[PDB]
């Protein structure tokens, strides 16, 4: 079970990671 | 017994979702009450 | 908006934990008796049997409409046309 | 005629899992229905395996197969587990 | 009438330019051939030999059709790297008497 | 204002590109180049198409993985004219293989190569543009395992989430949801007997209609909620599917009273003990919460101890 | 001890066994069949009822209702599969 | 009774006199379903696809009753 | 009977097992008279491209296989009266040849031509 | 009043709206009745089939239950 | 028969591996599988063509197969 | 990776057999996927019936049950 859950979770983690990057980036560049 | 795999995904999520509901209503009221002009 | 039409119908979505039968029970019960009669006389219908049929059919027809919607959607159509029902039935293979 | 049901044991089990909780007759009826449905699904499949052997008698062995065939993943793991425990629990005498 | 060898040409301006077969449909009627195009590039209207690839032809206009590394241009000039892979009727080309030998080894 | 072509610079480029929608009556190929402040797509027939980088609401890149085309999807903040029509969505793509077969390793391998070749070339173009753009145009890649079957317009397609949008760019017309604009989500028709359900999107500007995503299969119910959860998206379920146009004008006309009635809490299926309506609209059905009477238990003694062979 | 109580089970093993014997599932039936079966029933029953009581809590209720069973089966990926085409009747 | 007509778009009519031959191909509904082939004396060919095994026998009985030439009749 | 003779002279091809010669569409339509119950080359064109070959040389008219020399030299004495090719080039897949072998059907190539 | 219309267009319109179906051709409503009748006919036949073994001349929910099973429409909420 | 028996058998033994090693199959089973396999794909394509027809097209697409299986209830 | 071994023409020939006129290259990716899903369930069931029979090599008897159990039943055999 864990392999596909990890594959799905991974896609979710990547999304979360990319969202955070974008979140941090969006605020910083507009803040400048 | 106690064969359940883990807490249901909803139960975990519920707190955040319930949280989001509170956040949403506050958020919605300002944005919308402000937008009403 | 606190006014009627808003409150009840809005909340009825949440009040509707109920499973109200969508076909009118008596109008349907008469049809059951009718089709029952079409088969054979002397058939007492227990309301339970009437309910059993009614609930199954409603969900079942909704089921048929699930497929029919797909098939309309399939054909890039919103309005279902009998061809969709037919398509659905043919594909399901649920034909007499 | 005298009515037959499992609702009694369903409630006992409900209490065994949620003593603190009770249940309505309609939900009870559903659970009682489920007991009847799943019992026959397995009862039929256990019969076919015995029938494939061309034999007169059904055993827990047919059940393990039918359970794994009918029950999905976790349910098969646990049904194998809980079922093996339950078999063993009334095996220790003899 | 069979594929897979290295051959010599007979007709047209496409006289005797050696080629090979690239990929095969089972019908054994024609042979695909690794060839050099003889086009004018559709320019006398608004004969030659030069390998050409689908690119200056796109400035004159005409059919630019890519199938990836496999191409089609200006009226099915089936071409790749500027070479035709058009098939010829196996009788219309002189196929026999080549037989890749020890001296021959490098062309295709 | 302009575009400003990045003259005498190694302007990244892609050439196997079919624009969508077509400029003229029929499709054309062309190549896309990144310039000082925007892109340009130039057709093989000499037509010039320009896209300021800022005017791109989103740049989303669909690799040809499992798709007969590799696509760069542009969702725009404003619609732009293709002469024939104006579009807020644009695409650049190319065919991966034989789409019209009429009823092998080299061909199959060439597919693997050609895909990788294109896939790389595009991936390179993106990186070159991201670098050129000071990353201001990160190409969101739809997280395919996070996609699900649905219909935002008329036909069934695989909807896929991206870092900031939910989209389906394979089909046309293109479907793009900027999650920044999602006020709330409602899972209409959710019920146990159904096999599919629907999703409604509420926008932050209520003057604009909700969007449905009809017949999504119920097997995706929990995964979609989780995705929504991870996006900080509030969602709600409802077996019913009441009129949103009414609900919008209702709340548009009286948001004050709406919020006072708990606002959006109106969608809550009253799962857990919200004190405001702690008892919801509930009543006992018609039962004495199944309690087996004392006399019903007595027949158990005939469970006769016959040690029937193991 | 009742066969059920030998197994400590709530489920009437004699009923499960009796159902099979008179139910034409076979010419004969060995004790291991109803024994295993009765245990499986309580297991899945508990599996569901466990979710049901949880759902009842998740419904502000100490009283379980059919409405709660719908949430359990669709949220449980296994019951969702085991009860994929099943119909629940309620007025 | 004296021809075949395909109703609605594209509307097409056939007369048994215009038929050269026809056949009930192994169809598209079941391994025993059928599709109907028609070629006219004009060399123009028409074919009707996707028809149930059930309608195979009736059309089979019908065309023999119309005595028209079926490609597989020599089987 | 004459149903085995080219109905039309356009795109003639020879069966590759028994060398019977018929039109592209006659094989597609009718199959081989001596090998359809053994070959099943009937009704399809990819199959046609595989089994029926355009590369055949000369034609032989079978009149009396029971009392004839050509009937022998061409390996056709066991066939029914028809027109066959003197030599057809090509070869069958590595499966049907075994299926044929299993039935006691020995695939011998009709390729009478000498190679250079 | 004729019960075939008893499955009124609005009764149908409700079901189709629930099956997610949006616009509905008039034509549909009619076929729905046929389908429903076909559906019911198969079911009722089976209910009678069961009723005959039971030597009954009364139709019970059990017969319907035992029937819906046989059609892949297993129903919960009836019996003891 | 339309698939190469080797790749087919290779796949059968390969997926068998994911469930359990040691597993191999007598010819009768693998043939029976292919016999079943072909029937399923045949039915599905016919059905898919019905969709093709229904969608007013002749070029079938995965979505046609998806819908057919979707309506067929092949999935969970 | 033997699913890639299920040749496009093999699939293509079945599609022609199913009366399909035309196909889009994605059908192969899709067809392979479909073939796996069907196979996965049939073999898992075939495996389980064989596992019950206490054997490690599957027989036609076992596959008949796996298909029959799924309603995908085979024809032409008896015993
Ligand atoms: Zn022959």
Residue numbers in the entry:
A (entry chain R): 11 to 42
B (entry chain j): 462 to 498
C (entry chain a): 41 to 136
D (entry chain h): 33 to 126
E (entry chain Z): 273 to 318, 335 to 396
F (entry chain j): 649 to 751, 762 to 968
G (entry chain g): 16 to 106
H (entry chain k): 356 to 430
Relevant lines from the article:
The deposition of H3K36me3 occurs co-transcriptionally when the methyltransferase SETD2 associates with RNA polymerase II. The deposition of H3K36me3 is carried out by the conserved histone methyltransferase SETD251. Here we present three cryo-EM structures of SETD2 bound to RNA polymerase II elongation complexes at different states of nucleosome passage. Together with functional probing, our results suggest a 3-step mechanism of transcription-coupled H3K36me3 deposition.
We stalled the complex at a position that is known to trigger nucleosome transfer upstream of the Pol II (bp 64 of a modified Widom 601 sequence). We obtained a reconstruction that showed Pol II at a resolution of 2.85 Å. Focused classification of density upstream of Pol II revealed a FACT-bound hexasome and SETD2 bound to SPT6. In State 1, FACT binds the transferred hexasome in the region of upstream DNA above the Pol II active center cleft. Approximately 20 bp of DNA covers the histones from SHL − 0.5 to SHL + 1.5. FACT is bound to all histones and the DNA, covering a total of ~5200 Å2 in buried surface area. Elongation factors DSIF (SPT4/SPT5) and SPT6 are well positioned to stabilize the FACT-bound upstream hexasome. Based on CXL-MS data, we placed residues 266–315 of RTF1 into helical density on the surface of SPT16. In State 1, the catalytic SET domain is occluded from binding the hexasome by the presence of FACT. SETD2 is now poised for methylation, but FACT occludes the catalytic SET domain from binding.
